Design a protein around this ligand. Structure first.
Ligand SMILES: CC(=O)N[C@@H]1[C@@H](O)[C@H](O[C@@H]2O[C@H](CO[C@]3(C(=O)O)C[C@H](O)[C@@H](NC(C)=O)[C@H]([C@H](O)[C@H](O)CO)O3)[C@H](O)[C@H](O)[C@H]2O)[C@@H](CO)O[C@H]1O
Ligand SMILES: CC(=O)N[C@@H]1[C@@H](O)[C@H](O[C@@H]2O[C@H](CO[C@]3(C(=O)O)C[C@H](O)[C@@H](NC(C)=O)[C@H]([C@H](O)[C@H](O)CO)O3)[C@H](O)[C@H](O)[C@H]2O)[C@@H](CO)O[C@H]1O
Ligand SMILES: CC(=O)N[C@@H]1[C@@H](O)[C@H](O[C@@H]2O[C@H](CO[C@]3(C(=O)O)C[C@H](O)[C@@H](NC(C)=O)[C@H]([C@H](O)[C@H](O)CO)O3)[C@H](O)[C@H](O)[C@H]2O)[C@@H](CO)O[C@H]1O
Ligand SMILES: *[C@@H]1O[C@H](CO)[C@@H](O[C@@H]2O[C@H](CO)[C@@H](O[C@@H]3O[C@H](CO)[C@@H](O)[C@H](O)[C@@H]3O)[C@H](O)[C@H]2NC(C)=O)[C@H](O)[C@H]1NC(C)=O
Ligand SMILES: *[C@@H]1O[C@H](CO)[C@@H](O)[C@H](O)[C@H]1NC(C)=O
Ligand SMILES: *[C@@H]1O[C@H](CO)[C@@H](O)[C@H](O)[C@H]1NC(C)=O
Ligand SMILES: *[C@@H]1O[C@H](CO)[C@@H](O)[C@H](O)[C@H]1NC(C)=O
Lengths: 164, 321, 321, 164, 321, 164
């Protein structure tokens, strides 16, 4: 990964999380579960959706009859016509193949970036109130219940309350 | 008490290719390549194609006795020929600018056949009864339905002049023919005049034909030849035929409004009442995606043809369950 | 107390599109798309186009009487026709390989009209005075200025032989015509010989013409026709005319040095003294940018034509004031 | 943002800084003001200028007359000619649209990268002599005057001097 | 104690261009552009090209006397002409549909020249010995090896009739010519018949030719002209020649199976025994890379031609020793 | 550099390291030397190899004879043919030139990313047992012998052992 999160210091994905692309797993005395971050997920969905639609919709077409008929004294322009069709074929095949290869790379990088940004967003607000394990988790130095966990996910987390 | 940052995974086996790595398994993906068709010939622009059955376009326009006439719809978005369209010019010869004509008829509105020079009233001074075993119908020697073979009546072939004025308010396609006997004797026996000529003209069209007499192999057991010509007569314009012999005269002609940008498909696929924006010789395809590998020669608003067997775009992320 | 890291913002309302997000406001940007033109037809490579006034290229070359010469320029970078180029061949007929000639004359670095076969001295044995109401000037019957109508002198039309050697050190465009009377009586009345032919030859050019006598719909009150032919005579070569009738003879011809790679623009946009590297039918455009949406059919060193209404490249960053 | 600085942990831009793309704002007892980082700004300008010039100048142009004239018996090669022009039209429209979409994304990323690099560049030399609030700022644990502020902007800042 | 993270460096001076920065020195790189060729004309699809030596395709087919020492294979993948191929039609005139024939012979898999109308037994009542100074060889008047100039024997030129049936099981290319004397005296002197004709016919071919007698500028001291015609005779078909004069008769013809998709290369590069997938007029090139700047005109499966002098792809990283 | 390591806070390359693209330099009482990281180097080599092969192998064409011959009454279709050859030439030259410019940029970014990812992985496991200079090195606060140096390179470095 270009940004080093996915298959990075975060080694694997969560089948347990069904509601989004990126999210959180929390465990406290009240219970456990997976929760997807909707802000970062929906933005990613909006971005990728726009990318896909761009690749599809930017293609412009007119009504065209490709085929042409030539008699046996027209061989030269028949082959000119074939040269055109084959040239377009070489161009579109090459460009389509490379466009997909290159943009798939960028799409995976995009996800890798979003995970890292989310990770650093949480890490930034928690500060020294928690210790970073290195697998993408944080061991709290205080008690965090479901109301407290939601504050972290919501970005509304209150540092001075839990300053410990 | 801990909170963890992580990402989605599922049971998806979908794979994509990336510039750095082949065959990466991703959670979600979309297909950019249309690799399938419906196996049908469909309507283009809401209109069915012209189907010629046993005949090719030449047989149909000339009225080859084996072709079913008058059955043509008043419009079509393209033309379909099949592996079974064998019936062309039954009288051997050249059809001049044939490909051009096929192109010009590829799409039409307001198409109608009509009698330009009625057989009974048009030629009092010439014989209209000429037939050949080469164009046979119902066990008898016959001829093209849309043309007339004019020969001399009683050893004489007087100078003929025949005009048609186009009052139909659209273009008129006029087809005719010029007969080329193998020998000078045949020329005299049919048309009387060794010096015979055919002249055809309108405001924008002028051409003269003379018989080219040459010894030559029998085709469909005929050593003679018959060449076919055509022109598009503009609304209001007049066409004039003048001949001292050899004219295979227009009997029926065609009034039409030409479309544009269409073409001819050769396919044995069945025609149906379905609608498509893109037709291929194999069948119709969806036009939503940018690329298709079905066939390079298409008619419609079509995805670009490519050699690709697979184009698949990653949407979701690397799947690591 | 504090130092802060940050980035620029401004009042710019400029927007760009990105693959992830549409309509992103940026601080700075550049336009890659040329969406404007000057509404004029300009000089290409410092050279004005050929302007034909009331005439099309055929009328101009043949010398249609309605073509008043301003002493048409000796060179042009391309040719302009308008909705007003009406006066063509005033004597009805076909201009052979007309599209080819227009293309090959599209640019020239030198052009001169000269008298190839002077009317006064060239035809002692034939009448030169023929005119027609179909080509009229000032309310009187007239003829093409660059051609001469040869008819019989005193019941006789002897076989003519006339040659020109090209010492002009460049190509000479030679135009001529072949007249086709409506009836045999007219043929005899004009050229005396029913068997008349026209022969034209050079080192690379050989063609023979015979009269096609037929009644035809009247165009400009004429049932006859006159066909037009041409060839480019190479420097040092010779062209020879031989005729027993029907020849519409060269009077003036054109010595010229062809350029290449140009064409004809059809536009009513006004011609001006401005300069451009790229001309479109709508007007001239700046060639600095890679893309233009003004028009697909252009002449010059031109940006690639695209359908895009907007191509705008971000230079600065996201503007967040 | 791919690098998480612009519209990132740094939430907004400065209309106050007129002389560059990236830079500094300092506040001390001696006064306040905006200062653009000259090194990183000019480097970005050189890069973007090269990118724009590349897109424009790599385009090759020869004298061409696109138009062709055909008579009424030339319909087939007339439509062949049209197929060529429209095919070129489809190719250039698609590639130009996507090139701009794709490279605009990369240009914005580039700026985001430049901001983050600068942020971490300052953070690296300051170390624990200052406090990281978030938001792109640093609270000094010592007194920093205009001479000290200038040392930070030049990257010549002296760490061992201020202890604490 | 210390540990450091770092990256590779070397003395490599290799440079690449990047979108942000020109001329970046990198540790490793690969070339995407094929910038070299082998300076040879090689075999395509395992088969050598046809080389015509002093002759162009017209001279080779007609048997121009300068083409006698050529040794032709039974097949070729393409055709090579050189700057030395001057020897064409030595008797001046037009070669009809010449570019088309060249295209269609560009590749062939079974080629045999055979005697279609044997000189000794075919023409008892006509003279076969006609030559011209225009086709001179070794300073002596001569003629095409593959055609025969038929002139009158004694005082008369009787009507000739000769047919050939194609038993070769493949197409037979038949070439002939039609001579056009400058004057009636010469016409009478060669063929005796002022009214002469040439007629040629097959299943697909019908034409009658008459001599066009006219004075014309001399080419190689000839005011006459000789036109060249051809047809591909299908298996089983018959071609029939009839003439009262002016026929330049087939002597040898060519049985062949036409290939497709190839062309003609003009090059002075030596033909050698070697194989390539891509041939250019400068020499053969490696087809491994996607792009080549060697030459715009190629035959084969070829890298795309580009104007680039350099396409170099960074593999390693920025080199900072 | 987009990722800011190469020609970044790591200022130069090592001619001394012959066995890989990325690696380590160690100094202890037992000696000094260069060692290349095999994991990150080989991953990069595999990736770049795939990229190069993609650009080359995706190009596929058919047997084609480009040249065509026309007589002096065929000028229009001759120029049509010329428009085709020149159009293809403009398209391929532009796209090839830009493809190389753009992907060279990405390749250098790729290397820059790999170095940083390697740098932060070592920083992650070392933590405060070593001090971060900012030139890409780490001064140990404990004894690091060749076995200790290897534990860092192998990623098996044990932090609690050395709290000393
Ligand atoms: C003018 C004429 O009658 N000529 C006779 C030759 O036709 C004949 O050679 C035989 O001709 C056969 C074909 O005969 C038809 C046909 O096409 O079926 C008979 C048609 O009635 C006649 N049509 C008209 C309007 O006259 C037609 C026509 O003459 C030719 O098609 C025009 O060229 O001919 C068939 O080809 C035989 O193979 C052939 O031997 C010879 C010998 O009997 O006599 C000629 O007088
Ligand atoms: C040879 C001749 O004079 N024939 C006469 C017919 O032309 C004429 O029929 C009418 O002719 C009209 C056209 O007349 C001109 C013209 O084009 O203006 C008169 C010109 O002087 C004459 N030019 C020359 C060099 O002789 C010209 C020429 O004959 C034709 O262009 C040749 O094709 O004809 C008009 O077309 C009428 O529609 C047409 O019926 C009849 C009756 O007057 O007398 C004929 O002798
Ligand atoms: C039949 C004959 O001999 N006629 C004589 C004319 O040829 C001659 O005119 C002069 O001919 C010159 C070239 O003559 C050759 C040639 O090399 O091309 C001589 C060849 O033997 C002859 N070939 C044959 C089969 O007869 C050839 C042929 O006649 C021409 O090709 C005709 O197309 O001519 C040269 O062109 C001179 O410019 C020309 O005047 C005249 C002289 O008055 O006498 C004729 O008897
Ligand atoms: C040059 O072009 C002009 C057209 O801009 C020609 O002028 C006129 O053209 C009209 C056709 O639009 C002719 O109309 C006809 O008029 C006659 C009677 O005048 C009528 O019988 C016809 O049915 C038709 O309505 C008009 O005659 C014509 N005017 C003149 C004076 O000829 C002009 O003829 C062209 N000149 C040349 C030399 O080509
Ligand atoms: C075409 O029609 C002719 C008669 O018009 C007939 O001889 C022939 O058999 C038909 N085609 C086929 C394939 O049978
Ligand atoms: C094309 O197929 C159907 C049309 O019946 C359409 O619903 C579908 O969305 C299209 N394919 C894709 C991949 O969008
Ligand atoms: C082309 O000329 C200059 C130089 O690019 C430019 O300022 C001008 O606007 C351009 N022409 C038009 C009509 O925009």
């Amino acid at each position: 990964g270009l940004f080093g999160a996915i298959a990075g210091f975060i080694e694997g994905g969560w089948t347990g999380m069904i509601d989004g692309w990126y999210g959180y797993h929390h465990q406290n005395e009240q219970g456990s579960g997976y929760a997807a971050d909707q802000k970062s997920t929906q933005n990613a969905i909006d971005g990728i959706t726009n990318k896909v639609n761009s690749v599809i919709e930017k293609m412009n077409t007119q009504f065209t009859a490709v085929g042409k008929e030539f008699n046996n004294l027209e061989r030269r322009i028949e082959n000119l016509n074939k040269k055109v069709d084959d040239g377009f074929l070489d161009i579109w095949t090459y460009n389509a193949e490379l466009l997909v290869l290159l943009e798939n790379e960028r799409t995976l990088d995009f996800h890798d970036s979003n995970v890292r940004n989310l990770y650093e967003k949480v890490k930034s607000q928690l500060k020294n109130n928690a210790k970073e394990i290195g697998n993408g988790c944080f061991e709290f130095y205080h008690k965090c219940d479901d109301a407290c966990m939601e504050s972290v996910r919501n970005g509304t987390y209150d540092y001075p309350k839990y300053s410990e | 008490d801990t909170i963890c940052i992580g990402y989605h995974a599922n049971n998806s086996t979908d794979t994509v290719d990336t510039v750095l790595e082949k065959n990466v398994t991703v959670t979600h993906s979309v297909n950019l390549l249309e690799d399938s068709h419906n196996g049908k010939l469909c309507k283009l622009k809401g209109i069915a194609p012209l189907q010629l059955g046993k005949c090719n376009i030449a047989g149909w326009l000339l009225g080859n006795p084996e072709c079913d006439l008058l059955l043509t719809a008043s419009s079509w978005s393209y033309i379909v020929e099949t592996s079974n369209s064998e019936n062309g010019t039954c009288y051997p010869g050249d059809f001049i600018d044939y490909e051009e004509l096929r192109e010009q008829l590829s799409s039409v509105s307001s198409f109608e056949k009509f009698e330009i020079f009625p057989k009974t009233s048009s030629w009092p001074n010439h014989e209209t009864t000429g037939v050949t075993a080469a164009c046979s119908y119902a066990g008898a020697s016959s001829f093209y339905r849309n043309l007339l073979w004019l020969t001399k009546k009683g050893s004489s072939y007087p100078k003929l002049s025949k005009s048609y004025v186009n009052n139909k308010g659209k273009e008129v396609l006029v087809l005719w023919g010029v007969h080329h006997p193998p020998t000078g004797t045949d020329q005299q026996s049919l048309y009387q005049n060794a010096d015979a000529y055919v002249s055809v003209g309108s405001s924008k069209y002028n051409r003269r034909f003379t018989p080219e007499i040459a010894a030559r192999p029998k085709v469909r057991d005929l050593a003679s030849r018959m060449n076919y010509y055509w022109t598009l007569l503009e609304p209001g314009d007049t066409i004039t035929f003048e001949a001292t012999g050899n004219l295979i005269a227009p009997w029926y002609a065609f009034a039409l409004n030409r479309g544009s940008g269409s073409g001819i498909i050769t396919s044995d696929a069945p025609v149906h009442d379905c609608n498509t924006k893109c037709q291929t010789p194999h069948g119709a395809i969806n036009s939503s995606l940018p690329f298709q590998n079905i066939h390079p020669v298409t008619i419609g608003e079509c995805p670009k043809y490519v050699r690709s067997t697979k184009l698949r775009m990653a949407t979701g992320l690397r799947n690591i369950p």
